Write a protein that binds this DNA or RNA. Sequence first.
DNA 1: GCCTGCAGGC
DNA 2: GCCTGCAGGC
Lengths: 211, 223
Amino acid sequence: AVDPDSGLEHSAHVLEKGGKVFSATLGLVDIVKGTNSYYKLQLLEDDKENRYWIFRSWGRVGTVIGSNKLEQMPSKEDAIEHFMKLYEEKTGNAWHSKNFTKYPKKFYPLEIDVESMKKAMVEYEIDLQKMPLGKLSKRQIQAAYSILSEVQQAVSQGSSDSQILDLSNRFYTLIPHDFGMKKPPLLNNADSVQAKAEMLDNLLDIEVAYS
Amino acid sequence: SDKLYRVEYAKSGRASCKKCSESIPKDSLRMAIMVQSPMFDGKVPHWYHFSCFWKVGHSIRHPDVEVDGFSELRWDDQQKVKKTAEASKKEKDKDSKLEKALKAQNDLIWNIKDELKKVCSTNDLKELLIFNKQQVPSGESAILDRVADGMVFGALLPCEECSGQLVFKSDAYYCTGDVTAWTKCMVKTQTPNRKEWVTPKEFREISYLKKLKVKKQDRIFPP
DNA sequence: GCCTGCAGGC
DNA sequence: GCCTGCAGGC
Ligand SMILES: [Zn+2]
Ligand SMILES: [Zn+2]
């Protein structure tokens, strides 16, 4: 799917090489400094022409701060080289490889798939509130739930608050939220962990329904 | 760290003022206010000439802490800042003695840094840090400040948890290692582990500064 | 003098 | 996050 901030939502479609959807959404979180940043990267083909563009977008999740850049690449192949170069520069790990190794201060990829309208608009806005960067994959949501179990166990242990910080960072990176400008909160409270657990349960039910 | 105002010495001359909108020289005193960048996630410093900063409406009553990096300035400049901010005999003597010992530690560090700048190059200091099992920071000012700390207070030993390098902030020493590839090691202590400094074979000026050092000293921290 | 990476600026 | 004047490396 194409991004609208580029102005080519109807003019183009995302290029692909079978299983290489040239469209990535990366996120990085660090609570000790209160950063929760996203990065959209796309390589767009024309709707049907030999014209190919590169789109980059960044900022804080669910917040206005952040600009974008749409640059015209010369041909339909060197654009892929620029794509891979920026992917590695921002994540560390390669564009296509089984090794999803995290790197310090480097992003991590995110797997993605009548008065009725007056209220449907509000419903879709709250949908975006729950999913500030869009729909997620069941793999990553289940990984988030397993990390939630890890956090529940580490809080039951009541020890190693540094591990609590690390797990909270991993989670918030795996599950974005619209904190606005507020520093992401730690996950030391049993009530907070159970609340986000039931939130994930509702979301997982909604996703298994969508089939 | 997460403060609002920040003062230092110009690391380059490309910084454009925000009041007079004219370039600022290098190795000159400059203040700034941190503001959220509407272009990306994170604060950014709006810099101002020392003369242009006070005619804008910023009320700073105590720069002793309100300003980031206030403790790493030359004592005369710290005094000038304190003065411009406006425009118990046993306890007093103890406090004045600490302030005088703090001034002594300050100008001693800067005088050692100046002799280094005058009798060493950039790559010269690069090799000196590598000798004592220390990391090479990104920045000429950073490299200089670290070489001065290693000469006086001793070469820092790695962290006990992350096995990473430690650096001096305004308050105390912070660790910069990575406990994990996601977060960074958060260690903070006013008294780190460290062995003594080792000047290599090619250290003719070792006596030019180290010998002069009264030695037998430890970091004096702000209140 | 050329070049290419980057610490500094925003 | 991206832009670039610049210094060391040759
Ligand atoms: Zn000015
Ligand atoms: Zn450490």
